[PDB]
Amino acid sequence: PQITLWQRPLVTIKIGGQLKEALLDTGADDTVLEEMSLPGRWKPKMIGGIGGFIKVRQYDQIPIEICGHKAIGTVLVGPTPTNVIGRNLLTQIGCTLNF
Amino acid sequence: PQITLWQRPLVTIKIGGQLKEALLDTGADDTVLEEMSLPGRWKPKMIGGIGGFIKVRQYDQIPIEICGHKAIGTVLVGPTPTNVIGRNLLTQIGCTLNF
Ligand SMILES: C=CCNC(=O)[C@@H](NC(=O)[C@@](O)(CCCN(Cc1ccc(-c2cccs2)cc1)NC(=O)[C@@H](NC(=O)OC)C(C)(C)C)Cc1ccc(CC=C)cc1)C(C)C
Ligand SMILES: [Cl-]
Ligand SMILES: [Cl-]
Ligand SMILES: [Cl-]
């Protein structure tokens, strides 16, 4: 698709068999989702946003569908204001910025 | 141009007579720049993201040039850890996400 930016670029994702809404965020290196359950072991990560730093749980090699496009990669879980899909997965689904 | 998301999408902007580097950020409602002087009226604003909120000064009707594209809009100035171009100016230069 081509998505304009007059509104927030919110899309539906699917992860662990469940649908969620998430923001396509080119300003984020990483993908971070609100508290949820994921399989396997996690590692610690600190990520920085406009307000400072938070600790999140890093899960690797997680299948996730984004607007129907299949990806498998690293998903961080922690206290984010919204689910955000960052460049690590935007690249997997072939996303570019164009003007 | 077409901009890849393998790396952070950084561009040069011209604003208030100054050249600055900024991040094209589809996850940001607003454009936020590190401390700088701008002309005209302003009002205080709190903006939030991962890590919490910071206080900024809101200036309206500010001319900016982004990759040779001229636009005008609201610019927030404060203690942001990085300069971000938000949707309010991305729209004006006809920036879209594509995949
Ligand atoms: C005010 C109205 C609503 N709010 C916003 O629109 C705000 N947007 C936003 O905060 C976002 O667009 C994020 C902006 C991009 N941000 C910039 C950034 C980059 C590096 C640093 C650091 C460098 C060195 C030390 S720190 C700090 C900040 N990057 C990140 O945060 C990513 N960090 C990262 O990549 O590591 C380098 C992260 C996501 C943590 C992985 C997302 C968003 C969050 C919350 C809501 C609430 C919506 C209901 C919407 C969208 C602001 C900006 C208008
Ligand atoms: Cl990844
Ligand atoms: Cl504006
Ligand atoms: Cl348009």
PDB file of C-alpha atoms and ligand atoms in Angstrom:
ATOM      1  CA  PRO A   1       0.000   0.000   0.000  1.00  0.00           C
ATOM      2  CA  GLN A   2       0.810   3.702   0.005  1.00  0.00           C
ATOM      3  CA  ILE A   3       0.104   5.342   3.347  1.00  0.00           C
ATOM      4  CA  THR A   4      -0.163   9.110   3.718  1.00  0.00           C
ATOM      5  CA  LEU A   5       0.551  10.828   7.013  1.00  0.00           C
ATOM      6  CA  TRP A   6      -2.424  13.122   7.584  1.00  0.00           C
ATOM      7  CA  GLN A   7      -3.425  10.687  10.327  1.00  0.00           C
ATOM      8  CA  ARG A   8      -1.307   8.330  12.442  1.00  0.00           C
ATOM      9  CA  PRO A   9      -0.152   5.388  10.302  1.00  0.00           C
ATOM     10  CA  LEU A  10      -1.901   2.753  12.426  1.00  0.00           C
ATOM     11  CA  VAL A  11      -2.148  -0.742  10.992  1.00  0.00           C
ATOM     12  CA  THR A  12      -3.317  -4.130  12.185  1.00  0.00           C
ATOM     13  CA  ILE A  13      -0.651  -6.648  13.136  1.00  0.00           C
ATOM     14  CA  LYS A  14      -0.970 -10.276  14.172  1.00  0.00           C
ATOM     15  CA  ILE A  15       1.272 -11.855  16.779  1.00  0.00           C
ATOM     16  CA  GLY A  16       0.722 -15.037  18.777  1.00  0.00           C
ATOM     17  CA  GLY A  17      -2.536 -15.516  16.884  1.00  0.00           C
ATOM     18  CA  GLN A  18      -3.968 -12.223  18.159  1.00  0.00           C
ATOM     19  CA  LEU A  19      -4.742  -8.996  16.289  1.00  0.00           C
ATOM     20  CA  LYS A  20      -3.402  -5.686  17.595  1.00  0.00           C
ATOM     21  CA  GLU A  21      -3.098  -2.106  16.322  1.00  0.00           C
ATOM     22  CA  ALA A  22       0.388  -0.688  15.877  1.00  0.00           C
ATOM     23  CA  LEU A  23       2.044   2.468  14.595  1.00  0.00           C
ATOM     24  CA  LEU A  24       4.435   2.344  11.624  1.00  0.00           C
ATOM     25  CA  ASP A  25       7.317   4.338  13.086  1.00  0.00           C
ATOM     26  CA  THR A  26      10.329   5.193  10.937  1.00  0.00           C
ATOM     27  CA  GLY A  27      11.825   7.075  13.891  1.00  0.00           C
ATOM     28  CA  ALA A  28      12.163   3.843  15.883  1.00  0.00           C
ATOM     29  CA  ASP A  29      15.127   1.498  15.434  1.00  0.00           C
ATOM     30  CA  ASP A  30      13.243  -1.296  17.175  1.00  0.00           C
ATOM     31  CA  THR A  31       9.725  -2.718  17.495  1.00  0.00           C
ATOM     32  CA  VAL A  32       8.173  -2.357  20.946  1.00  0.00           C
ATOM     33  CA  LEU A  33       4.800  -3.716  22.029  1.00  0.00           C
ATOM     34  CA  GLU A  34       2.683  -3.198  25.130  1.00  0.00           C
ATOM     35  CA  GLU A  35       2.799  -5.868  27.840  1.00  0.00           C
ATOM     36  CA  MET A  36       1.905  -9.293  26.451  1.00  0.00           C
ATOM     37  CA  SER A  37       3.014 -12.924  26.624  1.00  0.00           C
ATOM     38  CA  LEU A  38       5.592 -14.342  24.216  1.00  0.00           C
ATOM     39  CA  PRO A  39       7.346 -17.732  24.124  1.00  0.00           C
ATOM     40  CA  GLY A  40      10.934 -18.584  24.955  1.00  0.00           C
ATOM     41  CA  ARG A  41      13.652 -16.737  26.834  1.00  0.00           C
ATOM     42  CA  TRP A  42      14.138 -12.980  26.811  1.00  0.00           C
ATOM     43  CA  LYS A  43      17.173 -10.737  27.276  1.00  0.00           C
ATOM     44  CA  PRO A  44      17.405  -7.249  28.781  1.00  0.00           C
ATOM     45  CA  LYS A  45      17.426  -4.097  26.694  1.00  0.00           C
ATOM     46  CA  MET A  46      17.319  -0.397  27.431  1.00  0.00           C
ATOM     47  CA  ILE A  47      15.739   1.805  24.787  1.00  0.00           C
ATOM     48  CA  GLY A  48      15.552   5.594  24.661  1.00  0.00           C
ATOM     49  CA  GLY A  49      12.633   7.777  23.634  1.00  0.00           C
ATOM     50  CA  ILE A  50      11.723  11.445  23.860  1.00  0.00           C
ATOM     51  CA  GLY A  51      11.126  11.194  27.603  1.00  0.00           C
ATOM     52  CA  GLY A  52      14.193   9.179  28.577  1.00  0.00           C
ATOM     53  CA  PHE A  53      15.032   5.489  28.879  1.00  0.00           C
ATOM     54  CA  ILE A  54      13.047   2.386  29.786  1.00  0.00           C
ATOM     55  CA  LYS A  55      13.858  -1.282  30.322  1.00  0.00           C
ATOM     56  CA  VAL A  56      12.154  -3.770  28.035  1.00  0.00           C
ATOM     57  CA  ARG A  57      12.154  -7.513  27.434  1.00  0.00           C
ATOM     58  CA  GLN A  58      13.801  -8.603  24.161  1.00  0.00           C
ATOM     59  CA  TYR A  59      12.372 -11.646  22.385  1.00  0.00           C
ATOM     60  CA  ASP A  60      14.098 -12.859  19.206  1.00  0.00           C
ATOM     61  CA  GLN A  61      12.846 -14.605  16.064  1.00  0.00           C
ATOM     62  CA  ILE A  62       9.146 -13.954  16.693  1.00  0.00           C
ATOM     63  CA  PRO A  63       6.679 -14.378  13.832  1.00  0.00           C
ATOM     64  CA  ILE A  64       4.566 -11.280  13.272  1.00  0.00           C
ATOM     65  CA  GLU A  65       2.257 -10.229  10.443  1.00  0.00           C
ATOM     66  CA  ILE A  66       2.096  -6.523   9.593  1.00  0.00           C
ATOM     67  CA  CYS A  67      -0.730  -5.367   7.333  1.00  0.00           C
ATOM     68  CA  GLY A  68      -0.796  -8.951   6.044  1.00  0.00           C
ATOM     69  CA  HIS A  69       2.947  -8.983   5.327  1.00  0.00           C
ATOM     70  CA  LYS A  70       4.868 -11.749   7.104  1.00  0.00           C
ATOM     71  CA  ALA A  71       7.917 -10.952   9.208  1.00  0.00           C
ATOM     72  CA  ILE A  72      10.005 -12.817  11.777  1.00  0.00           C
ATOM     73  CA  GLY A  73      12.257 -10.864  14.101  1.00  0.00           C
ATOM     74  CA  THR A  74      13.012  -9.136  17.350  1.00  0.00           C
ATOM     75  CA  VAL A  75      10.131  -7.821  19.415  1.00  0.00           C
ATOM     76  CA  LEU A  76      10.617  -5.758  22.566  1.00  0.00           C
ATOM     77  CA  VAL A  77       7.935  -5.793  25.257  1.00  0.00           C
ATOM     78  CA  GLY A  78       7.515  -2.981  27.779  1.00  0.00           C
ATOM     79  CA  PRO A  79       5.717   0.173  28.939  1.00  0.00           C
ATOM     80  CA  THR A  80       5.264   1.963  25.624  1.00  0.00           C
ATOM     81  CA  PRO A  81       2.507   4.538  24.961  1.00  0.00           C
ATOM     82  CA  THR A  82       1.528   2.599  21.835  1.00  0.00           C
ATOM     83  CA  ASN A  83       2.562  -0.509  19.942  1.00  0.00           C
ATOM     84  CA  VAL A  84       5.263   0.614  17.531  1.00  0.00           C
ATOM     85  CA  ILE A  85       6.691  -1.152  14.499  1.00  0.00           C
ATOM     86  CA  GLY A  86      10.266   0.028  14.023  1.00  0.00           C
ATOM     87  CA  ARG A  87      12.802  -0.207  11.221  1.00  0.00           C
ATOM     88  CA  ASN A  88      13.894  -3.746  12.123  1.00  0.00           C
ATOM     89  CA  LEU A  89      10.524  -5.026  10.823  1.00  0.00           C
ATOM     90  CA  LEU A  90       9.683  -2.212   8.384  1.00  0.00           C
ATOM     91  CA  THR A  91      12.719  -3.377   6.408  1.00  0.00           C
ATOM     92  CA  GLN A  92      11.468  -6.975   6.383  1.00  0.00           C
ATOM     93  CA  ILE A  93       8.195  -5.916   4.740  1.00  0.00           C
ATOM     94  CA  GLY A  94       9.936  -3.737   2.141  1.00  0.00           C
ATOM     95  CA  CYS A  95       8.874  -0.357   3.491  1.00  0.00           C
ATOM     96  CA  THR A  96      10.382   2.877   2.182  1.00  0.00           C
ATOM     97  CA  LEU A  97       9.721   6.588   2.583  1.00  0.00           C
ATOM     98  CA  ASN A  98       8.966   8.457  -0.640  1.00  0.00           C
ATOM     99  CA  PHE A  99       8.458  12.097  -1.591  1.00  0.00           C
TER     100      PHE A  99
ATOM    101  CA  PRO B   1      13.556  10.600  -3.412  1.00  0.00           C
ATOM    102  CA  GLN B   2      13.061   7.069  -2.200  1.00  0.00           C
ATOM    103  CA  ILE B   3      14.536   6.634   1.263  1.00  0.00           C
ATOM    104  CA  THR B   4      15.578   3.215   2.530  1.00  0.00           C
ATOM    105  CA  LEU B   5      15.011   2.212   6.159  1.00  0.00           C
ATOM    106  CA  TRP B   6      18.121   0.075   6.532  1.00  0.00           C
ATOM    107  CA  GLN B   7      19.540   3.124   8.325  1.00  0.00           C
ATOM    108  CA  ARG B   8      17.932   5.962  10.279  1.00  0.00           C
ATOM    109  CA  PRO B   9      16.339   8.287   7.712  1.00  0.00           C
ATOM    110  CA  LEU B  10      18.311  11.456   8.451  1.00  0.00           C
ATOM    111  CA  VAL B  11      17.980  14.571   6.320  1.00  0.00           C
ATOM    112  CA  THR B  12      19.218  18.147   6.342  1.00  0.00           C
ATOM    113  CA  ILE B  13      16.724  20.870   7.168  1.00  0.00           C
ATOM    114  CA  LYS B  14      17.006  24.644   6.958  1.00  0.00           C
ATOM    115  CA  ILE B  15      15.189  26.493   9.713  1.00  0.00           C
ATOM    116  CA  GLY B  16      15.612  29.919  11.297  1.00  0.00           C
ATOM    117  CA  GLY B  17      18.670  30.551   9.136  1.00  0.00           C
ATOM    118  CA  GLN B  18      20.331  27.385  10.461  1.00  0.00           C
ATOM    119  CA  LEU B  19      21.182  24.004   8.912  1.00  0.00           C
ATOM    120  CA  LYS B  20      20.347  21.014  11.109  1.00  0.00           C
ATOM    121  CA  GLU B  21      20.176  17.235  10.829  1.00  0.00           C
ATOM    122  CA  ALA B  22      16.806  15.661  11.607  1.00  0.00           C
ATOM    123  CA  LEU B  23      15.084  12.275  11.611  1.00  0.00           C
ATOM    124  CA  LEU B  24      12.061  11.643   9.364  1.00  0.00           C
ATOM    125  CA  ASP B  25       9.698  10.221  11.963  1.00  0.00           C
ATOM    126  CA  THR B  26       6.290   8.829  10.947  1.00  0.00           C
ATOM    127  CA  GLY B  27       5.665   7.935  14.605  1.00  0.00           C
ATOM    128  CA  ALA B  28       5.783  11.594  15.662  1.00  0.00           C
ATOM    129  CA  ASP B  29       2.650  13.782  15.496  1.00  0.00           C
ATOM    130  CA  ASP B  30       4.783  16.915  15.823  1.00  0.00           C
ATOM    131  CA  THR B  31       8.184  18.233  14.750  1.00  0.00           C
ATOM    132  CA  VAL B  32      10.566  18.641  17.699  1.00  0.00           C
ATOM    133  CA  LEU B  33      13.995  20.243  17.643  1.00  0.00           C
ATOM    134  CA  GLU B  34      16.757  20.705  20.208  1.00  0.00           C
ATOM    135  CA  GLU B  35      17.089  24.104  21.867  1.00  0.00           C
ATOM    136  CA  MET B  36      17.245  26.935  19.363  1.00  0.00           C
ATOM    137  CA  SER B  37      15.864  30.431  18.890  1.00  0.00           C
ATOM    138  CA  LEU B  38      12.812  31.096  16.742  1.00  0.00           C
ATOM    139  CA  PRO B  39      10.907  34.347  16.089  1.00  0.00           C
ATOM    140  CA  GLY B  40       7.383  35.228  17.155  1.00  0.00           C
ATOM    141  CA  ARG B  41       4.885  33.979  19.717  1.00  0.00           C
ATOM    142  CA  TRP B  42       5.056  30.643  21.529  1.00  0.00           C
ATOM    143  CA  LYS B  43       3.178  28.647  24.163  1.00  0.00           C
ATOM    144  CA  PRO B  44       4.291  25.822  26.441  1.00  0.00           C
ATOM    145  CA  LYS B  45       3.396  22.209  25.686  1.00  0.00           C
ATOM    146  CA  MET B  46       4.074  18.770  27.150  1.00  0.00           C
ATOM    147  CA  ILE B  47       4.835  15.982  24.727  1.00  0.00           C
ATOM    148  CA  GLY B  48       5.182  12.330  25.507  1.00  0.00           C
ATOM    149  CA  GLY B  49       6.737   9.158  24.164  1.00  0.00           C
ATOM    150  CA  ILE B  50       8.721   6.233  25.471  1.00  0.00           C
ATOM    151  CA  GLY B  51      10.234   7.277  28.794  1.00  0.00           C
ATOM    152  CA  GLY B  52       7.595   9.910  29.568  1.00  0.00           C
ATOM    153  CA  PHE B  53       7.086  13.599  28.823  1.00  0.00           C
ATOM    154  CA  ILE B  54       9.178  16.713  28.224  1.00  0.00           C
ATOM    155  CA  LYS B  55       8.191  20.385  28.230  1.00  0.00           C
ATOM    156  CA  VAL B  56       8.669  22.247  24.953  1.00  0.00           C
ATOM    157  CA  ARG B  57       7.914  25.634  23.414  1.00  0.00           C
ATOM    158  CA  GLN B  58       5.397  25.563  20.574  1.00  0.00           C
ATOM    159  CA  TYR B  59       5.998  27.966  17.680  1.00  0.00           C
ATOM    160  CA  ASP B  60       3.445  28.155  14.869  1.00  0.00           C
ATOM    161  CA  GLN B  61       3.738  29.149  11.195  1.00  0.00           C
ATOM    162  CA  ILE B  62       7.487  28.516  10.978  1.00  0.00           C
ATOM    163  CA  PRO B  63       9.050  28.189   7.513  1.00  0.00           C
ATOM    164  CA  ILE B  64      11.264  25.159   6.990  1.00  0.00           C
ATOM    165  CA  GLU B  65      13.013  23.549   4.046  1.00  0.00           C
ATOM    166  CA  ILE B  66      13.476  19.780   3.987  1.00  0.00           C
ATOM    167  CA  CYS B  67      15.396  18.246   1.084  1.00  0.00           C
ATOM    168  CA  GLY B  68      14.700  21.315  -1.035  1.00  0.00           C
ATOM    169  CA  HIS B  69      11.001  21.095  -0.248  1.00  0.00           C
ATOM    170  CA  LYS B  70       9.634  24.219   1.413  1.00  0.00           C
ATOM    171  CA  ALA B  71       6.891  23.882   4.002  1.00  0.00           C
ATOM    172  CA  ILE B  72       5.392  25.837   6.873  1.00  0.00           C
ATOM    173  CA  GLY B  73       4.118  24.514  10.179  1.00  0.00           C
ATOM    174  CA  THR B  74       4.400  24.167  13.926  1.00  0.00           C
ATOM    175  CA  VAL B  75       7.825  23.507  15.440  1.00  0.00           C
ATOM    176  CA  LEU B  76       8.333  22.395  19.028  1.00  0.00           C
ATOM    177  CA  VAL B  77      11.598  23.319  20.733  1.00  0.00           C
ATOM    178  CA  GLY B  78      12.995  21.691  23.874  1.00  0.00           C
ATOM    179  CA  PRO B  79      15.203  18.998  25.438  1.00  0.00           C
ATOM    180  CA  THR B  80      14.573  16.276  22.864  1.00  0.00           C
ATOM    181  CA  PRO B  81      17.402  13.758  22.569  1.00  0.00           C
ATOM    182  CA  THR B  82      17.215  14.032  18.772  1.00  0.00           C
ATOM    183  CA  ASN B  83      15.785  16.337  16.114  1.00  0.00           C
ATOM    184  CA  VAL B  84      12.652  14.794  14.586  1.00  0.00           C
ATOM    185  CA  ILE B  85      10.497  15.822  11.652  1.00  0.00           C
ATOM    186  CA  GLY B  86       6.936  14.773  12.454  1.00  0.00           C
ATOM    187  CA  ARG B  87       3.819  14.123  10.403  1.00  0.00           C
ATOM    188  CA  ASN B  88       2.716  17.765  10.514  1.00  0.00           C
ATOM    189  CA  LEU B  89       5.580  18.644   8.157  1.00  0.00           C
ATOM    190  CA  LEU B  90       6.015  15.284   6.411  1.00  0.00           C
ATOM    191  CA  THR B  91       2.525  15.733   4.896  1.00  0.00           C
ATOM    192  CA  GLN B  92       3.503  19.076   3.394  1.00  0.00           C
ATOM    193  CA  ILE B  93       6.409  17.656   1.397  1.00  0.00           C
ATOM    194  CA  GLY B  94       4.233  14.800   0.158  1.00  0.00           C
ATOM    195  CA  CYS B  95       5.974  12.088   2.148  1.00  0.00           C
ATOM    196  CA  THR B  96       4.376   8.615   2.141  1.00  0.00           C
ATOM    197  CA  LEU B  97       5.148   5.127   3.414  1.00  0.00           C
ATOM    198  CA  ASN B  98       5.196   2.476   0.702  1.00  0.00           C
ATOM    199  CA  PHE B  99       5.455  -1.302   0.724  1.00  0.00           C
TER     200      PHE B  99
HETATM  201  C1  LIG C   1       2.644  14.209  21.291  1.00  0.00           C
HETATM  202  C2  LIG C   1       1.803  13.347  20.698  1.00  0.00           C
HETATM  203  C3  LIG C   1       2.096  11.848  20.782  1.00  0.00           C
HETATM  204  N1  LIG C   1       3.550  11.643  20.820  1.00  0.00           N
HETATM  205  C4  LIG C   1       4.308  11.746  19.720  1.00  0.00           C
HETATM  206  O1  LIG C   1       3.843  11.804  18.582  1.00  0.00           O
HETATM  207  C5  LIG C   1       5.816  11.574  19.969  1.00  0.00           C
HETATM  208  N2  LIG C   1       6.355  10.503  19.109  1.00  0.00           N
HETATM  209  C6  LIG C   1       7.124   9.531  19.629  1.00  0.00           C
HETATM  210  O2  LIG C   1       7.601   9.584  20.763  1.00  0.00           O
HETATM  211  C7  LIG C   1       7.521   8.402  18.660  1.00  0.00           C
HETATM  212  O3  LIG C   1       7.281   8.815  17.313  1.00  0.00           O
HETATM  213  C8  LIG C   1       9.007   8.085  18.824  1.00  0.00           C
HETATM  214  C9  LIG C   1       9.846   9.174  18.158  1.00  0.00           C
HETATM  215  C10 LIG C   1      11.161   8.557  17.689  1.00  0.00           C
HETATM  216  N3  LIG C   1      12.073   8.374  18.828  1.00  0.00           N
HETATM  217  C11 LIG C   1      13.035   9.292  18.739  1.00  0.00           C
HETATM  218  C12 LIG C   1      14.179   9.069  19.499  1.00  0.00           C
HETATM  219  C13 LIG C   1      15.297   8.474  18.923  1.00  0.00           C
HETATM  220  C14 LIG C   1      16.453   8.291  19.674  1.00  0.00           C
HETATM  221  C15 LIG C   1      16.507   8.729  20.994  1.00  0.00           C
HETATM  222  C16 LIG C   1      17.610   8.522  21.716  1.00  0.00           C
HETATM  223  C17 LIG C   1      18.850   8.746  21.251  1.00  0.00           C
HETATM  224  C18 LIG C   1      19.844   8.574  22.151  1.00  0.00           C
HETATM  225  C19 LIG C   1      19.423   8.403  23.480  1.00  0.00           C
HETATM  226  S1  LIG C   1      17.617   8.419  23.369  1.00  0.00           S
HETATM  227  C20 LIG C   1      15.390   9.327  21.566  1.00  0.00           C
HETATM  228  C21 LIG C   1      14.240   9.530  20.809  1.00  0.00           C
HETATM  229  N4  LIG C   1      12.529   7.287  18.789  1.00  0.00           N
HETATM  230  C22 LIG C   1      12.131   6.399  19.722  1.00  0.00           C
HETATM  231  O4  LIG C   1      11.413   6.680  20.682  1.00  0.00           O
HETATM  232  C23 LIG C   1      12.755   5.000  19.575  1.00  0.00           C
HETATM  233  N5  LIG C   1      14.119   4.999  20.124  1.00  0.00           N
HETATM  234  C24 LIG C   1      15.145   4.572  19.379  1.00  0.00           C
HETATM  235  O5  LIG C   1      14.951   4.273  18.201  1.00  0.00           O
HETATM  236  O6  LIG C   1      16.387   4.446  19.932  1.00  0.00           O
HETATM  237  C25 LIG C   1      17.325   5.294  19.259  1.00  0.00           C
HETATM  238  C26 LIG C   1      11.930   3.923  20.293  1.00  0.00           C
HETATM  239  C27 LIG C   1      10.465   4.007  19.853  1.00  0.00           C
HETATM  240  C28 LIG C   1      12.020   4.120  21.809  1.00  0.00           C
HETATM  241  C29 LIG C   1      12.494   2.542  19.932  1.00  0.00           C
HETATM  242  C30 LIG C   1       6.720   7.122  18.950  1.00  0.00           C
HETATM  243  C31 LIG C   1       5.560   7.420  19.653  1.00  0.00           C
HETATM  244  C32 LIG C   1       5.537   7.290  21.035  1.00  0.00           C
HETATM  245  C33 LIG C   1       4.377   7.595  21.738  1.00  0.00           C
HETATM  246  C34 LIG C   1       3.208   7.925  21.059  1.00  0.00           C
HETATM  247  C35 LIG C   1       2.067   8.257  21.791  1.00  0.00           C
HETATM  248  C36 LIG C   1       0.821   8.223  20.905  1.00  0.00           C
HETATM  249  C37 LIG C   1      -0.378   8.116  21.492  1.00  0.00           C
HETATM  250  C38 LIG C   1       3.225   8.021  19.671  1.00  0.00           C
HETATM  251  C39 LIG C   1       4.389   7.724  18.968  1.00  0.00           C
HETATM  252  C40 LIG C   1       6.562  12.902  19.736  1.00  0.00           C
HETATM  253  C41 LIG C   1       7.999  12.624  19.281  1.00  0.00           C
HETATM  254  C42 LIG C   1       5.843  13.758  18.683  1.00  0.00           C
HETATM  255 CL    CL C   2      14.882  -8.145  13.865  1.00  0.00          CL
HETATM  256 CL    CL C   3       1.417  22.355  11.788  1.00  0.00          CL
HETATM  257 CL    CL C   4      -1.532  13.873  -0.043  1.00  0.00          CL
END
